Amino acid sequence: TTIVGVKFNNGVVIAADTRSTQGPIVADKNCAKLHRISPKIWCAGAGTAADTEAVTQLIGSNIELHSLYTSREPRVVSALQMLKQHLFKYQGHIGAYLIVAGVDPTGSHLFSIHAHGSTDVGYYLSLGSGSLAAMAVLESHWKQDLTKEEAIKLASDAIQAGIWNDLGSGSNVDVCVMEIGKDAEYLRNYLTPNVREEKQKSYKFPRGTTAVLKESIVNICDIQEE
Amino acid sequence: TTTLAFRFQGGIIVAVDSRATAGNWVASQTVKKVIEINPFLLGTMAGGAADCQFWETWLGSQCRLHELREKERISVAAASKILSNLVYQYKGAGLSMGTMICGYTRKEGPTIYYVDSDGTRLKGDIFCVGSGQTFAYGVLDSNYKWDLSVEDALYLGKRSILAAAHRDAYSGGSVNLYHVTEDGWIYHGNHDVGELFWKVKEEEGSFNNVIG
Amino acid sequence: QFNPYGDNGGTILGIAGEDFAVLAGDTRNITDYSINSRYEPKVFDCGDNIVMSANGFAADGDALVKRFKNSVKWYHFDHNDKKLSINSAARNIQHLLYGKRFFPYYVHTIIAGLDEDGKGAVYSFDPVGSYEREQCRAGGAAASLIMPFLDNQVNFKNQYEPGTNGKVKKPLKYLSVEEVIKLVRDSFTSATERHIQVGDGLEILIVTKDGVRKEFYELKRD
Amino acid sequence: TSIMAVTFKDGVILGADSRTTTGAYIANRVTDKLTRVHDKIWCCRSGSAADTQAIADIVQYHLELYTSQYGTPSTETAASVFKELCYENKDNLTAGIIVAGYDDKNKGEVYTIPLGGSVHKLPYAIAGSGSTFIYGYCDKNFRENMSKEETVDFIKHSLSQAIKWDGSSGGVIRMVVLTAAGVERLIFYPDEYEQL
Amino acid sequence: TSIMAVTFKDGVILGADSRTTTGAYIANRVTDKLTRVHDKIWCCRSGSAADTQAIADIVQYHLELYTSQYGTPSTETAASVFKELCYENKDNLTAGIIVAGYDDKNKGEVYTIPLGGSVHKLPYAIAGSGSTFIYGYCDKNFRENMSKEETVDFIKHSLSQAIKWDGSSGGVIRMVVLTAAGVERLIFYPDEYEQL
Amino acid sequence: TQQPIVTGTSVISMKYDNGVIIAADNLGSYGSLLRFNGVERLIPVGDNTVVGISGDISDMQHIERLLKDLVTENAYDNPLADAEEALEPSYIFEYLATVMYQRRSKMNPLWNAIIVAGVQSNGDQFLRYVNLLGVTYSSPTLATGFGAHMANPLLRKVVDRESDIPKTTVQVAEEAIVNAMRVLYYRDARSSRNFSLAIIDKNTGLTFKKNLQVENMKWDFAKDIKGYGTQK
Amino acid sequence: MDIILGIRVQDSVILASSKAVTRGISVLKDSDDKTRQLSPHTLMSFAGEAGDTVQFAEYIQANIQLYSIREDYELSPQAVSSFVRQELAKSIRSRRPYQVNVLIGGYDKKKNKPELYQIDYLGTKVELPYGAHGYSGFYTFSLLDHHYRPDMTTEEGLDLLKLCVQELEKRMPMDFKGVIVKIVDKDGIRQVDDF
Amino acid sequence: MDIILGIRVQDSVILASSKAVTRGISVLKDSDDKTRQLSPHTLMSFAGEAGDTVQFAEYIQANIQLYSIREDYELSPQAVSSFVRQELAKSIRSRRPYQVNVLIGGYDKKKNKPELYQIDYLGTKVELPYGAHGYSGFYTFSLLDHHYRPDMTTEEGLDLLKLCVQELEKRMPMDFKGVIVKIVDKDGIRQVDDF
Amino acid sequence: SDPSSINGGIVVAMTGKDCVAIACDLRLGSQSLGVSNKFEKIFHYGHVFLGITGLATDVTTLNEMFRYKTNLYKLKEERAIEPETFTQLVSSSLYERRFGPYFVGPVVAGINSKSGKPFIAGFDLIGCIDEAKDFIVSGTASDQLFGMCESLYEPNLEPEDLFETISQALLNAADRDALSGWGAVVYIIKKDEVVKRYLKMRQD
Ligand SMILES: [Mg+2]
Ligand SMILES: [Mg+2]
Ligand SMILES: [Mg+2]
Ligand SMILES: [Mg+2]
């Protein structure tokens, strides 16, 4: 998994690769590692895929209820405090390693959070097995006062480093841009640098190739009238 | 792995399956679990493929040297004991072997020795070795007679492997048959279990639990 | 504790044609989640029209290939430059492997060439020297992904002739070198999609009576 | 982690490195290990980031609620709340905390709370993996009632050595000055402190 | 065990504590950890007493036999013989040795041989459990080409701190001075060095 | 079987149009203690080869002595010891690779990862890796330890395949190596600021650079970072 | 406990269960009946850990007998087997699971059909023509696969069962002291007293 | 191997030894003779680890047969038992010991007396009126203690042995497939072919 | 010992043109011992189909559980549950046993009754959703299935072509797995007709 967050002038950009693995086998070639906590608070998730989804939806649900109760747009620090206290309670057994980003009435924010409950602040962050490849790119090209276009470039380049050099990461780059005073734009499959080449042969079988013992109609419909 | 060998009026029948698995996945369906030691002697493979294959080929070299020196065919007793004494030197090191050394000589008649990697050497009339042995034994014990014909004995060995191939997950692929006579062994072909099962089901009326 | 073994990944594939043989293998070399090299040759020409690959732990794989190559050289010295036949090579490799029965070469070995009648030959070895002549054999990481496909598309397993409904099998017609190479390429393209240790490049060594020829193809680098 | 708190004439100064490691990988090179529990009571965190963050957050909550009811808490009270959490949950925590604060009545005070949950009031305190290398230096060079500039130099020189030798420590030296005048943050970069 | 060797203008000085422990019991409080392998090549022993004694004895034998054949050995040669034993028997030894010697050609030289069996030529070296506490101090206070009196003070102050903090170190500070003038033994008692 | 004690971290290297570059920091770590600050881990053999070594330093020093002895031995009864029968990078590597694999096979390894960088007689670039297991591989970029994870991704952006080697100048290659050394200093907890770098070029020969430093470091952004979440 | 077999024929279910009770070194009993009647036309044989086997079997028996009284009605074999499965499936994630494998042989009076259900301690249920637990199947299934027919009489089923028991007595290392055989049909449950 | 018994009567030694050879799951043979004739009037039964048992027994046989040829003389049972004990006592401190327990039944032609020696794998020798190895004694010794007399005939010894075998067949969990019985007397060794 | 490979078995699901296909082998075993050749692993709740591989007691339990839940859903919602909604229910249900999970590999397949859109999904044992366009694989021969599917599959296959592809994917995968086979079933699912075919295969 290769996930990054990069701060820029008017907001924060977040990005991830799209490979999910069971040992050495690619279970999903287009996994979604970017999660929406609220409309303008998104996070990137590494570790146990079920946990990153579950923990973002739980906190995202409670955030929504809190937003309705307080008549205020949600804050990143709220999502952050709720995530860390939850993960700390479970002593790391909930394997969720998140990069939490967003915009709110206070400004634009970028945090990382470890499965044990520790949080970190930064202008650029990476996480997962491709984090070292990504962080190398971030450490070589990051600067203060990046523009939106530069940050999307830097973020996706850092993910690419992971795609190519880390066996845990692969396929496509997903991006989400959260700019102040603007709708968060979720760029699903922003880059697609791993389309499989046309096969040498078609493996479409002639009809009646498979041997068949029995056939029957399945009754999916309900009990009928008359 | 299901290997059997039994003694009867017409010599020895040897029948084996063909399957090799790594963990849950089937590495090979085309494994030769009969080692042709020489033209008169057969060995079965169970436990370690390498250990059986290597040391029973080596055995064939020792048998050849014996008959060059003594100007006489080696006895099944002597051949089996060369192998058993060898593996017994390696006891503890971790060889894995369960084999039937099978031969037909004038002095002895048809003879089977179960040889085994913890040093066991047993003469006997019927032997089954492998994960599917218990299934093969059932069919053998209920149908075996000394006065079987060569045709019926061949079928019995084939059918006993089929019984194991069906039930035992780690046995199958195909059945290899051998008939050992005093003038040497005779190969009686490779029989795909998939095709054999349906053939046997229909012709025999067995396996009514299975839909075909 | 010191672990003398390691896993360098990779996948190899030997297919025996009617009058040719191919031994293919990806060119990626890895440890854990890192790539060591995108092009590290794994299949070798060993002389006497024999090709070999020892896939798994690359240090043992290189040692074994090196020793076998040396065995070809000394066979020529000891036996009046006699050509080492593929079956003889196979038996020799068994003894090399079984020589280390109690501290094994951690490799799955395949060799390919032509038998003494000019027909295609592949031999497959386990780590301790058990071996068999085979028509078709994938070795290494993505072997479980490739073999079921080859059962279906080379040997036509589970394929019956339309209209008969399971009564007549699809006949086992002989494949050309061009047809085999398509199945090799598609095996590795598919394996690359679904196995993280397979990729970068595919090097195929084709053996005929005319000698050993090489072909190289790109694979996805992610 | 290299952390210390030193009391001087005008109050107290907390000092820390900025390195967070996972094995030999530096996960964060700009960590803030100096954390605010009250306006003029701060702490230095060593051990588990997750544990020390969680503890500090609870302490900040307790002192906020204390303040609403009973007015400003003493530095001793803050150290007691830290101690209570650390001692009562000693089996599940890995936290070494130095509590530092400025009262007007008491002036600069430093309390160290090592792994066990014991409390030790000291003129100065050092902690974290990098502290081992500077026990000798700090003991030889510490004086009571130093000036602000002397204490900044003392901390800067000490942590410079701790960083030099300890692979677990590095990055910037952060400091927080606590006096009657208020709260001042200081930072010192590698190019400055490495040449000392 | 706290031990160090420091090179200065006139030669080299070896310094050591005198404590041998079995667990928390002090088995010997007047141990001599500074040992002679040649007239002007000495060593400092850390780790296993049995191993370092056995090694030193073999080295003394090798340099005695070297001297009978080839004349006086260099300090580098002595360090190489120590290294050979320590490196080739690394699996069975627990020995950290500082080799110190005075040639007329080369002057004062210090070689440290840590656990692995590697050799490191240095201006000065510190070792043993107590050395950890004085990395900061020694690095801040060492200068090249000190006088005899400065180097004695440097060693005395350093080992005083190492002893103060390390429970495994204590007793007297022994020193051995190696110069053209000859071999001088020095001893410093607790009442002297504790008040520094 | 042993455990490494005094250790050296990443060695990084790459090929460029006319030769190879190799670099390694000057630190000998003792666990988390940064014990020895003046350790040379690039060891030149002749004027055409540099062997870069990471891992156990006592074993490095042994390998250093084997190479020194190899040069002596090659000179014996060899009138062309400084010419046609001089040691090649490929000879030095193959020797080391034999030793490494023999030692792992006796269950007593030299606890190292080694990169042999050099230029052959015919001007060809030599760059190959061998480690404590006797595993060997070659690639346009090679790195040990942390370098494998952080340097390779950066160096592979310059030379991603074989066809990129003739397009890469020595200035571009050196720049990439020096930047990679900075990245490793930021992020490897067992690294030092001081390092050595060696260039082996087929025209200009062996250039060995000692006492280099990581410079142009970005730390200023650290001042703005406050707390771990909600603090101001 | 050791060997438990089951065979569903045309019009009945036959359960054969070993008589031996061994506690380590000695055979403490050679006449143990490893079965309980759950209802007039439903029999359950069992084998597994000591204590748990009987405790489970009687607990099930009590519950089915309670149902029979409350509703004045006999549950179908299918219903009983589902109840038993759920209890075992509940049991496997308990603090201390029941280590009990069962065969449920019943005659469904509504459908006029014999039914044999095999359920292991995990709660793994299967309906079968013939079944076993433990090692018993390894010896016997090759014989049952060969000879079994769905239209067999009760007497033919008993002969096939004798052949299975003989093969067990030949090739099993343990002396299981023979089997008690019971037949479940439309007239209820009865024990074959000579086998 | 499992059960080996021995009983010395008035004028002979009787050795009873089980016929079963079990390899884990299946009984591979039910007619195994766990004995070797060392000399015309000395028989040795054996039980222990697979392979080692026969290897040891035949090694002893060969050595006694070599002695018999060299000296043209049969060693006394006592002498043979001492030779065997020393081999086992040597074996216990070897790299890989022989895991073999033996009974040596012999008729001393000089003294005109039957003799029974029990020797375990450690080289622990005892001369006894009756003996066993493994669990066999636990079941049988209470019967032998009661009924045994030093003046018993061979037929009375065989009857007492049948009672021992019956008690074993009742209370032992393992099916040892009966016993082969051999008698050692002044006329040599002979096998009782019906038991 | 490993709960997900005691009983064995496989499920595969594929999408085609206005259709989905889901298939499974029929084996239930006790490790090496084959026990049943009629253990179906596909179930349905109205028009939504669920395949479940893994530990057989959990397969049975989860089927009984989703029947329970979809029955109540229908009573309250007054309509049959859809594949997209059911997928979320399966995910929720599994995750609520996060630290004591059902040892299963569920696979959802069906066509949305309102939109007509073909839908398939896979899950890990704790409920992570893999919603693939092309195909989903599950069970003890999942590696073998990945290999078959990755080469054999092409998009927008007609129902009767898709049948051949999924059948050959299952059959040849199962023959390279010791713990799968003993028969097979293939469901071909269109918007308002579902055909179920039993396949003839080798019985070892
Ligand atoms: Mg089978
Ligand atoms: Mg890949
Ligand atoms: Mg540092
Ligand atoms: Mg199968």
From Swiss-Prot, chain A:
The keyword Oxidoreductase does not apply. The active site is at residue 1. InterPro entries: Ntn_hydrolases_N (IPR029055), Pept_T1A_subB (IPR000243), Proteasome_bsu_C (IPR024689), Proteasome_bsu_CS (IPR016050), Proteasome_sua/b (IPR001353), Proteasome_suB-type (IPR023333). Keywords: Cytoplasm, Hydrolase, Nucleus, Protease, Proteasome, Threonine protease, Zymogen. GO terms for biological process: proteasomal ubiquitin-independent protein catabolic process; proteasome-mediated ubiquitin-dependent protein catabolic process. It is found in: Cytoplasm; Nucleus. Disulfide bonds: none annotated. It catalyses: Cleavage of peptide bonds with very broad specificity. GO terms for cellular component: cytosol; nucleus; proteasome complex; proteasome core complex, beta-subunit complex; proteasome storage granule. GO terms for molecular function: endopeptidase activity; threonine-type endopeptidase activity. The keyword Transit peptide does not apply. Its EC number is 3.4.25.1. It is an enzyme of class 3 (hydrolase). Belongs to the peptidase T1B family. The side chain of Thr-1 acts as a nucleophile, and the N-terminal amino group acts as a proton acceptor. Present with 11400 molecules/cell in log phase SD medium. This is Proteasome subunit beta type-2. It comes from Saccharomyces cerevisiae (strain ATCC 204508 / S288c). The lineage of its organism: Eukaryota, Fungi, Dikarya, Ascomycota, Saccharomycotina. The gene is PUP1.
UniProtKB/Swiss-Prot annotation, chain C:
Its main location: cytoplasm. One of its GO terms (cellular component) is cytosol. Keywords: Cytoplasm, Nucleus, Proteasome. It holds the Pfam family Proteasome. Transmembrane segments: none annotated. It is found in: Cytoplasm; Nucleus. InterPro entries: Ntn_hydrolases_N, Proteasome_bsu_CS, Proteasome_sua/b, Proteasome_suB-type. One of its GO terms (biological process) is proteasome-mediated ubiquitin-dependent protein catabolic process. The 26S proteasome consists of a 20S proteasome core and two 19S regulatory subunits. The 20S proteasome core is composed of 28 subunits that are arranged in four stacked rings, resulting in a barrel-shaped structure. The two end rings are each formed by seven alpha subunits, and the two central rings are each formed by seven beta subunits. The catalytic chamber with the active sites is on the inside of the barrel. Belongs to the peptidase T1B family. Non-catalytic component of the proteasome which degrades poly-ubiquitinated proteins in the cytoplasm and in the nucleus. It is essential for the regulated turnover of proteins and for the removal of misfolded proteins. The proteasome is a multicatalytic proteinase complex that is characterized by its ability to cleave peptides with Arg, Phe, Tyr, Leu, and Glu adjacent to the leaving group at neutral or slightly basic pH. It has an ATP-dependent proteolytic activity. This is Proteasome subunit beta type-6.
From Swiss-Prot, chain F:
InterPro entries: Ntn_hydrolases_N (IPR029055), Proteasome_beta4 (IPR016295), Proteasome_bsu_CS (IPR016050), Proteasome_sua/b (IPR001353), Proteasome_suB-type (IPR023333). Keywords: Cytoplasm, Nucleus, Proteasome. It is found in: Cytoplasm; Nucleus. Pfam families: Proteasome. The keyword Nucleus applies. GO terms for cellular component: cytosol; nucleus; proteasome complex; proteasome core complex, beta-subunit complex; proteasome storage granule. PROSITE patterns: PROTEASOME_BETA_1, PROTEASOME_BETA_2. GO terms for biological process: proteasomal ubiquitin-independent protein catabolic process; proteasome assembly; proteasome-mediated ubiquitin-dependent protein catabolic process. It comes from the Eukaryota. The keyword Nucleus applies. Non-catalytic component of the proteasome which degrades poly-ubiquitinated proteins in the cytoplasm and in the nucleus. It is essential for the regulated turnover of proteins and for the removal of misfolded proteins. The proteasome is a multicatalytic proteinase complex that is characterized by its ability to cleave peptides with Arg, Phe, Tyr, Leu, and Glu adjacent to the leaving group at neutral or slightly basic pH. It has an ATP-dependent proteolytic activity. PRE3 and PRE4 are necessary for the peptidyl-glutamyl-peptide-hydrolyzing activity. Present with 16900 molecules/cell in log phase SD medium. Belongs to the peptidase T1B family. PANTHER family: METALLOPROTEASE TLDD, PROTEASOME SUBUNIT BETA. This is Proteasome subunit beta type-7.
UniProtKB/Swiss-Prot annotation, chain I:
Keywords: Cytoplasm, Isopeptide bond, Nucleus, Phosphoprotein, Proteasome, Ubl conjugation. SUPFAM superfamilies: N-terminal nucleophile aminohydrolases (Ntn hydrolases). It is found in: Cytoplasm; Nucleus. Coiled coil: none annotated. PROSITE patterns: PROTEASOME_BETA_1, PROTEASOME_BETA_2. One of its GO terms (cellular component) is proteasome complex. GO terms for molecular function: endopeptidase activator activity. There is a cross-link at residue 69 (Glycyl lysine isopeptide (Lys-Gly) (interchain with G-Cter in ubiquitin)). GO terms for biological process: proteasomal ubiquitin-independent protein catabolic process; proteasome-mediated ubiquitin-dependent protein catabolic process. It comes from the Eukaryota. Its main location: cytoplasm. The modification Phosphoserine is found at residue 30. Gene3D superfamilies: Glutamine Phosphoribosylpyrophosphate, subunit 1, domain 1. It holds the Pfam family Proteasome. InterPro entries: Ntn_hydrolases_N, Proteasome_beta_3, Proteasome_bsu_CS, Proteasome_sua/b, Proteasome_suB-type. PANTHER family: METALLOPROTEASE TLDD, PROTEASOME SUBUNIT BETA TYPE-3. The 26S proteasome consists of a 20S proteasome core and two 19S regulatory subunits. The 20S proteasome core is composed of 28 subunits that are arranged in four stacked rings, resulting in a barrel-shaped structure. The two end rings are each formed by seven alpha subunits, and the two central rings are each formed by seven beta subunits. The catalytic chamber with the active sites is on the inside of the barrel. Belongs to the peptidase T1B family. This is Proteasome subunit beta type-3. The gene is PUP3.
